[PDB]
């Protein structure tokens, strides 16, 4: 019966105030309660705010809700934003039906930079027995989350056969992985492959050799 | 302590039916309505249906044109979503959620439903071997998500990273790692335990030096 529009994403800085909006397309935002849910990566939603501005006990008092009638929008304000607040935030209201906003992804920069750790693994003998080879590069313990991953064969950039996962937060930092698909012969052929990762302008690499 | 535990998801063929369950406890089940809500990256959260505290009034959302029906068994304190005539576009994570008049006060853990005429594919699991040492398990070529990976049946919990999967030519691959003191590796077996619920498969791989 109406739509709730939320920005796709906001990127802010540790300690800042940040406001996440939720605009009702038709009918007054104030005509029924608006609620807010936090959803971490891979987890179920939990209530941040209900009944426009009420806070469950246990939710930090830096979260607050309000209603801005001039823009027909509900607002989730987070003061002194923390990196643990990185999450997707959904607004919710209702009238004759029940409506969710599309969710805003909140990114929080400004924690101490953490350069990634690399772990590399060659193909297993069991996999080679089937004539295939997967080179594994695991990227962990880094913050913030963008990385550029590149593979080398003999020091030359190799593109074909590469699949890299988008980083995900686990705990307090980010992890990512990249794979180089080879045939058994391509692996035996050269005498070096390298996983190279660039993060905030810093580059780390490790190599694999038969 | 409110608990909403969902079951019954997995992979189903188009045109077939599936019935999800939500076992409730830790609150007076018959004093509150219950809803089902699904989630995708492209369509966000969509309300499917709600049922009232006394199980006698039901409300359906327009996202599914009546193909799903909601019911409850108050003696088993369990809610159900019967999903008929399933379509590719119904692939989603399905949540049950308890209501408290004006908002959803608790959510279940979610279950994945994948509607596909592609076969279930079980992973191939390979051991990754190289003061602390990092060991790994390559979980190659499965469909659909999810898989679970533990180390020594969960007895190795710190030091574990299970990395998000890549998707290529319709199959997922991931790796999981654990870091242990090298003294552990040289004197104790380390095994990864891979479960792919949708193919009902379970594989153990010992990581040997």
């Amino acid at each position: 019966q109406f739509v709730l529009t939320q920005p796709n994403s906001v990127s802010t800085n540790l300690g800042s105030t940040v406001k996440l909006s939720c605009k009702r397309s038709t009918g007054n935002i104030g005509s029924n309660y608006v609620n807010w849910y936090q959803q971490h990566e891979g987890r179920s939603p939990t209530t941040m705010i209900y009944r426009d501005d009420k806070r469950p006990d246990g939710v930090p008092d830096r979260f607050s809700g309000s209603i801005d009638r001039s823009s027909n929008s509900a607002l989730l304000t987070i003061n002194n934003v923390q990196t643990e607040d990185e999450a997707d935030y959904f607004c919710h209201s209702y009238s004759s039906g029940i409506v969710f906003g599309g969710g805003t992804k909140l990114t929080v920069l400004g924690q101490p930079k953490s350069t990634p750790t690399l772990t590399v693994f060659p193909p297993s003998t069991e996999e080679l027995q089937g004539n295939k080879a997967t080179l594994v590069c695991l990227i962990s313990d880094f913050y913030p989350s963008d990385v550029e991953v590149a593979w080398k064969a003999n020091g030359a950039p190799i593109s074909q056969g590469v699949d890299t996962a988008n980083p995900t937060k686990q705990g307090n930092k980010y992890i990512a992985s990249s794979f180089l698909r080879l045939t058994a012969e391509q692996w035996r052929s050269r005498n070096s492959f390298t996983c190279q990762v660039t993060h905030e302008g810093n580059t780390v690499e490790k190599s694999l050799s038969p | 302590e409110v608990q909403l535990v969902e079951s019954g998801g997995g992979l189903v063929q188009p045109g077939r039916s599936l019935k999800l369950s939500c076992a409730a406890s830790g609150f007076t089940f018959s004093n509150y309505g219950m809803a089902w809500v699904r989630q995708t990256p492209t369509k966000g959260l969509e309300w499917i249906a709600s049922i009232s505290a006394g199980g006698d009034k039901t409300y359906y959302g327009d996202s599914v044109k009546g193909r799903f029906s909601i019911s409850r068994d108050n003696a088993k304190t369990t809610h159900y979503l019967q999903m008929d005539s399933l379509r590719s576009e119904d692939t989603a994570t399905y949540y049950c959620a308890k209501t408290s008049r004006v908002y959803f006060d608790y959510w279940g853990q979610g279950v994945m439903v994948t509607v596909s005429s592609a076969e279930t594919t079980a992973p191939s699991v390979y051991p990754l071997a190289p003061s602390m040492v990092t060991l790994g398990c390559l979980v190659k070529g499965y469909f659909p998500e999810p898989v679970t990976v533990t180390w020594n049946s969960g007895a190795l919990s710190s030091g574990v990273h299970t990395f998000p999967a890549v998707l290529q030519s319709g199959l997922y691959t991931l790796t999981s790692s654990v870091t242990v003191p090298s003294s552990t590796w040289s004197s104790q077996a380390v095994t990864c335990n891979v479960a792919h619920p949708a193919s009902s498969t379970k594989v153990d791989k010992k990581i040997v030096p």
Binding site: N32 | G33, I51, T58
Partner: peptide, 12 residues
Amino acid sequence: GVAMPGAEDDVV
């Protein structure tokens, strides 16, 4: 405020 659809018989 009015209850959401389905929630009108919730005890609180």
